[PDB]
Design an enzyme around this catalytic site. Structure first.
Site, mmCIF file in Angstrom:
data_model
loop_
_atom_site.group_PDB
_atom_site.id
_atom_site.type_symbol
_atom_site.label_atom_id
_atom_site.label_comp_id
_atom_site.label_asym_id
_atom_site.label_seq_id
_atom_site.Cartn_x
_atom_site.Cartn_y
_atom_site.Cartn_z
ATOM 1 N N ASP A 1 -36.289 8.684 1.495
ATOM 2 C CA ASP A 1 -35.213 9.535 0.909
ATOM 3 C C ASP A 1 -34.232 8.627 0.153
ATOM 4 O O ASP A 1 -34.494 7.381 0.006
ATOM 5 C CB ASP A 1 -34.563 10.399 1.990
ATOM 6 C CG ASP A 1 -33.964 11.706 1.464
ATOM 7 O OD1 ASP A 1 -33.500 11.715 0.275
ATOM 8 O OD2 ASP A 1 -33.985 12.691 2.221
ATOM 9 N N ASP B 1 -37.167 15.821 -6.238
ATOM 10 C CA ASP B 1 -36.210 16.786 -5.629
ATOM 11 C C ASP B 1 -35.200 17.311 -6.697
ATOM 12 O O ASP B 1 -35.046 16.654 -7.734
ATOM 13 C CB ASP B 1 -35.463 16.104 -4.491
ATOM 14 C CG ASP B 1 -34.555 16.997 -3.688
ATOM 15 O OD1 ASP B 1 -34.860 18.224 -3.552
ATOM 16 O OD2 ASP B 1 -33.555 16.466 -3.191
ATOM 17 N N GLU C 1 -34.494 22.443 -9.805
ATOM 18 C CA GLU C 1 -34.184 23.878 -10.102
ATOM 19 C C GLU C 1 -33.812 24.060 -11.582
ATOM 20 O O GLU C 1 -34.167 25.087 -12.162
ATOM 21 C CB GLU C 1 -33.115 24.441 -9.178
ATOM 22 C CG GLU C 1 -33.624 24.661 -7.760
ATOM 23 C CD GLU C 1 -33.847 23.362 -6.991
ATOM 24 O OE1 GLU C 1 -33.124 22.378 -7.264
ATOM 25 O OE2 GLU C 1 -34.744 23.345 -6.115
ATOM 26 N N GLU D 1 -30.795 21.647 -9.943
ATOM 27 C CA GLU D 1 -29.831 22.095 -8.900
ATOM 28 C C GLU D 1 -28.517 22.523 -9.589
ATOM 29 O O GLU D 1 -27.949 23.505 -9.176
ATOM 30 C CB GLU D 1 -29.536 20.987 -7.886
ATOM 31 C CG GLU D 1 -28.241 21.210 -7.140
ATOM 32 C CD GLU D 1 -28.284 20.747 -5.710
ATOM 33 O OE1 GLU D 1 -27.446 19.907 -5.329
ATOM 34 O OE2 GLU D 1 -29.177 21.229 -4.992
ATOM 35 N N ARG E 1 -39.569 20.890 -5.518
ATOM 36 C CA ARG E 1 -38.743 21.968 -4.920
ATOM 37 C C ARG E 1 -38.769 23.203 -5.807
ATOM 38 O O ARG E 1 -38.452 24.297 -5.299
ATOM 39 C CB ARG E 1 -37.320 21.478 -4.678
ATOM 40 C CG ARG E 1 -36.682 22.128 -3.467
ATOM 41 C CD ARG E 1 -35.451 21.381 -3.015
ATOM 42 N NE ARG E 1 -34.390 21.620 -3.968
ATOM 43 C CZ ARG E 1 -33.117 21.383 -3.752
ATOM 44 N NH1 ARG E 1 -32.724 20.838 -2.620
ATOM 45 N NH2 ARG E 1 -32.227 21.711 -4.675
ATOM 46 N N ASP F 1 -33.995 23.505 2.157
ATOM 47 C CA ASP F 1 -33.061 23.061 3.211
ATOM 48 C C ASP F 1 -32.895 24.169 4.262
ATOM 49 O O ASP F 1 -31.770 24.629 4.510
ATOM 50 C CB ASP F 1 -31.762 22.595 2.572
ATOM 51 C CG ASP F 1 -31.945 21.372 1.714
ATOM 52 O OD1 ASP F 1 -33.051 20.806 1.762
ATOM 53 O OD2 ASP F 1 -30.990 21.015 0.982
ATOM 54 N N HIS G 1 -39.215 16.995 8.659
ATOM 55 C CA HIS G 1 -38.115 16.414 7.833
ATOM 56 C C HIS G 1 -36.795 17.118 8.205
ATOM 57 O O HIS G 1 -36.815 18.346 8.362
ATOM 58 C CB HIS G 1 -38.483 16.519 6.348
ATOM 59 C CG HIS G 1 -37.436 16.020 5.402
ATOM 60 N ND1 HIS G 1 -37.089 14.690 5.328
ATOM 61 C CD2 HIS G 1 -36.690 16.675 4.464
ATOM 62 C CE1 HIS G 1 -36.165 14.531 4.380
ATOM 63 N NE2 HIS G 1 -35.896 15.745 3.838
HETATM 64 O O1 LIG Z 1 -28.988 18.809 -1.130
HETATM 65 S S1 LIG Z 1 -29.671 17.992 -0.170
HETATM 66 O O2 LIG Z 1 -29.034 17.681 1.059
HETATM 67 N N1 LIG Z 1 -31.144 18.655 0.022
HETATM 68 C C1 LIG Z 1 -32.085 17.969 -0.852
HETATM 69 C C2 LIG Z 1 -33.544 18.049 -0.408
HETATM 70 O O3 LIG Z 1 -33.961 19.411 -0.341
HETATM 71 C C3 LIG Z 1 -33.776 17.365 0.950
HETATM 72 O O4 LIG Z 1 -35.166 17.500 1.316
HETATM 73 C C4 LIG Z 1 -33.402 15.912 0.862
HETATM 74 O O5 LIG Z 1 -33.649 15.275 2.120
HETATM 75 C C5 LIG Z 1 -31.930 15.765 0.434
HETATM 76 C C6 LIG Z 1 -31.495 14.319 0.262
HETATM 77 O O6 LIG Z 1 -32.228 13.697 -0.792
HETATM 78 C C7 LIG Z 1 -31.542 16.532 -0.820
HETATM 79 O O7 LIG Z 1 -30.101 16.633 -0.848
#
Ligand SMILES: O=S1(=O)N[C@@H]2[C@H](O)[C@@H](O)[C@H](O)[C@@H](CO)[C@@H]2O1
Ligand SMILES: O=C([O-])C(=O)[O-]
Length: 780
Positions: free
Chosen positions: A262, A375, A378, A380, A426, A443, A503
């Site tokens: 990560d 990751d 979207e 995001e 994602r 998440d 995870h």
């Molecule tokens: O907004 S988050 O907390 N969620 C995201 C991903 O969905 C997770 O899987 C991953 O572990 C996180 C950290 O890289 C990312 O930041």
């Protein structure tokens, strides 16, 4: 007010002129049609279609009030006045336009009374999304549980109980109204983008999905290691911690194929480093040695990457210089606030963006990275005034992830033509599976409601092209202390869904190796079972690559003339033979399983159940979840290995679930080198087939192998065939005409070649399965 004016035929494509403009109709196959409205004008290209520029010969006939455009299965009936297209499988009406297309982009169609509508991708609304309206705008839903109208990975598509799939082939911010506003109208809207839909028909749900994946894309067989055990958390802080986790899988005797790194691999903090896309050397001092040391233990390394380059990152200036980032309308790099900091978005729709990003993936892959986690796709955060090479943020939004996958897939194939890319993301679009996209449900909260929603999410994504949809096993978001029972139920369910990747946020351990003795004593033999079951799972993977058949199938596949089954999201098929019912609440002491009519066995206890429709009640225990095996199933196992790098099928164990109610049964085991992306196309595989013929006085097995084989393929497999519910009246086995006596004692305690265990009703045959056809004949 809309009406027919005339039509041409150009390259097998029908071009219709109305009062409002042009409509282009092209058959992409004999059961799939692309309907492009505003065909005259420059639009964004198709994203959903694997072959955008394809159109097969259709027949055109003309009447007084209507045209007919037919492909062979699918018929477009064009009513001239008022203008309306409807769609027929032969003479059965699937789908009719109401007002059809209008102005903002709008499509309107009638819903039939009682028609049930799956679709929209990730929502937690119930399997039949009829009576719901929701946006088409990929967006985070952090900490979701038992409800969501809008998540990471929407699809502009539906599947009807009428056995069609409809695709809104449009990438923009939009919405779907599934007879919510108007009880008998389905409406598709977008702010902009392409004015096109795709209708696909089938005679059954499996042939519908085969037809759909034919024109939108077939997932390439992932590397066999994608079916293994992943070590993941948010996040390993250091090389020491990552090495200590791989070591913990070794010392705790859990299988491990892949460790996932990560965002701490590229910085010491959550915030402010994203875009570095390079090792944090203070915390990962010897990463090349690290990845090579893991590869020696058969362990792959996967690194997270994101679309965002922060202005605080080491790569901001270089990205700006290379013109790699999306721009404001004034033509500067667009910078905006993410949770992670202030930064831009790499423009994967641009030549400069694609080349810059691709170069970084190439460099890190050369250092030893085996696979990729993309990751926040979207994307995001995507401010509406962000400009990509081909459109603004709101126009391209739902295809960003799709194009990122394409870019990364093409890049990995060009660097490693003899390897299968692993790309976990994602967010994508219809067709993203053709770039090997492996999605996860983001998440999810560490709650029972989070677990209880996963089958619904998986089936909705599986039905529309995404066989490898999975969850963060154990849950991801918040919590302060482990909910042990929930965690255990989640990692049990995990064995029977596509990707075994626990995870979560690292204040609570996600990895099973870090759990208490009770938890490990429950999960260790189930994670081994997952590996022993690789021939079952990898064969379901093969069928997914061949036909789009998803690994998880909904209960409603069992009876296509009973639409009430569509609502079920508590029971599903893992491959052809297992009906799995996850436990999704605490202290559940028994369950009612709506098993299709026929004979079923307890996977764990061998108990035989028959039903004529009535559900089956099974007790529950903490060590398992309810799994029933279908009579006539062949369940193949190999010995457990620590890593798929060590996988061998030298030794097979196949369990056949015999019942006179199934007079004919077929199984298959797909074997290849587990890594060659060309194995299926070049026939470099070993396809084992088993056929059982079960009559009143005989049980006959026919075994065969096809394909050209592959390097390291065993010529001869030591095979133990275990026949469950076997008759106690079999005297004689013929193997290829040679008669052998069946022993009736000490089966577990002699090197018996045929032995009947009377206490367990199991007949064990031990033999050599070589390259030639083998027939095994049991007779009374
Ligand atoms: O907004 S988050 O907390 N969620 C995201 C991903 O969905 C997770 O899987 C991953 O572990 C996180 C950290 O890289 C990312 O930041
Ligand atoms: O299944 C059979 O044939 C039996 O039980 O003997």
């Amino acid at each position: 007010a809309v009406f027919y004016k005339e039509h041409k035929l150009r390259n097998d494509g029908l071009v219709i002129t109305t009062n409002q403009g042009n409509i282009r109709l092209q058959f992409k196959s004999e059961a799939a049609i692309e309907v492009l409205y505003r065909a005259d004008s420059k639009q964004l290209p198709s994203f959903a279609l694997a072959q955008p520029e394809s159109a097969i010969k259709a027949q055109l006939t003309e009447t007084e009030n209507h045209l007919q455009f037919s492909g062979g299965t699918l018929t477009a009936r064009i009513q001239k006045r008022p203008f309306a297209i409807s769609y027929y499988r032969d003479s059965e009406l699937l789908l009719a336009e109401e007002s059809g297309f209008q102005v903002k982009i709008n499509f309107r169609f009638y819903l039939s009374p009682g028609e049930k509508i799956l679709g929209g991708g990730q929502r937690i609304l119930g399997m039949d999304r009829r009576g719901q309206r929701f946006p088409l705008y990929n967006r985070a839903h952090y900490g979701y549980s038992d409800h969501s109208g809008q998540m990471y990975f929407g699809l502009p598509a539906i599947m009807s109980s009428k056995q069609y799939i409809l695709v809104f082939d449009n990438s923009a911010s939009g919405a779907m109204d599934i007879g919510k506003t108007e009880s008998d109208i389905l409406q598709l809207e977008a702010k902009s983008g392409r004015s096109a839909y795709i209708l696909v028909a089938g005679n059954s749900y499996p042939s519908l999905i085969e037809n759909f994946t034919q024109v939108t894309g077939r997932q390439p067989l992932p590397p066999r290691w994608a079916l293994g055990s992943f070590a993941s958390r948010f996040g390993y802080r250091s090389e020491a911690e990552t090495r200590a986790t791989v070591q913990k899988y070794k010392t705790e005797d859990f299988p491990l194929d892949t460790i996932v790194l990560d965002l701490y691999w590229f910085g010491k903090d959550i915030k402010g480093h994203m875009g570095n896309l390079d090792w944090d050397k203070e915390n990962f001092p010897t990463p090349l040695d690290m990845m090579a040391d893991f590869k020696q233990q058969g362990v792959k390394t996967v690194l997270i990457t994101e679309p965002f380059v922060l202005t605080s990152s080491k790569r901001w200036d270089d990205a700006v210089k290379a013109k790699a980032l999306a721009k404001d309308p004034q033509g500067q790099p667009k910078a905006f606030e993410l949770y992670f900091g202030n930064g831009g978005i790499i423009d994967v729709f641009s030549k400069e963006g694609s080349r810059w990003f691709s170069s970084i993936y190439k460099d890190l892959s050369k250092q030893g990275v085996a696979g990729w986690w993309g990751d926040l796709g979207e994307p995001e955060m995507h401010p509406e005034d962000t400009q990509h090479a081909i459109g603004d943020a709101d126009t391209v939004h739902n295809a960003y992830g799709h194009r990122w996958a394409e870019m990364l897939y093409q890049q990995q194939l060009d660097q490693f033509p003899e390897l299968r890319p692993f790309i976990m993301m994602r967010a994508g679009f219809v067709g993203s599976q053709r770039y090997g996209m492996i999605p996860w449900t983001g998440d999810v909260s560490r709650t029972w409601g989070g677990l209880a929603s996963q089958v619904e999410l998986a089936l909705q994504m599986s039905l529309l092209g995404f066989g490898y949809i999975h969850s963060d096993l154990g849950g991801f978001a918040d919590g302060e202390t482990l909910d042990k029972e929930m965690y255990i139920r989640w990692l049990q369910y995990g064995v029977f869904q596509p990707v075994y990747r626990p995870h979560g946020q690292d204040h609570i351990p996600s990895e099973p190796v870090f759990q208490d003795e009770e938890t490990k004593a429950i999960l260790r033999p189930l994670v081994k079972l997952r590996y022993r079951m690789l021939p079952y799972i990898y064969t379901a993977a093969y069928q997914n690559t061949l036909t789009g058949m998803p690994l998880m199938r909904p209960l409603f596949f069992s009876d296509e003339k009973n639409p009430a089954l569509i609502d079920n999201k508590t029971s599903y098929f893992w491959g052809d033979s297992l009906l799995v019912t996850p436990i999704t609440q605490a202290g559940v002491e028994s369950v009612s399983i709506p098993a299709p009519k026929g004979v079923w066995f307890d996977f764990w206890k061998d108990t035989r159940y028959q039903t004529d429709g009535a559900p089956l009640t099974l007790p529950t225990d903490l060590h398992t979840i309810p799994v029933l095996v279908k009579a006539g199933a062949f369940m193949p196992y190999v010995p457990a290995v620590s890593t798929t790098e060590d996988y061998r099928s030298d030794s097979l164990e196949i369990h056949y679930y015999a019942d006179a109610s199934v007079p004919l049964a077929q199984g298959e085991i797909f074997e290849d080198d587990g890594k060659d992306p060309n194995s299926i196309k070049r026939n470099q595989f070993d396809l084992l087939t088993l056929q059982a013929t079960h009559t009143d006085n005989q049980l006959h097995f026919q075994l065969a192998r096809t394909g050209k084989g592959y390097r390291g393929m065993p010529e001869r497999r030591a095979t133990t065939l275990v026949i469950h519910n076997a008759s106690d009246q079999y005297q004689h086995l013929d193997i290829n005409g040679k008669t052998i006596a069946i022993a009736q004692a000490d089966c577990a305690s002699t090197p018996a070649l045929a032995c009947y265990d009377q206490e367990r009703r199991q007949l064990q045959l031990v033999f050599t399965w070589g390259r030639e056809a083998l027939n095994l004949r049991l007779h009374k």
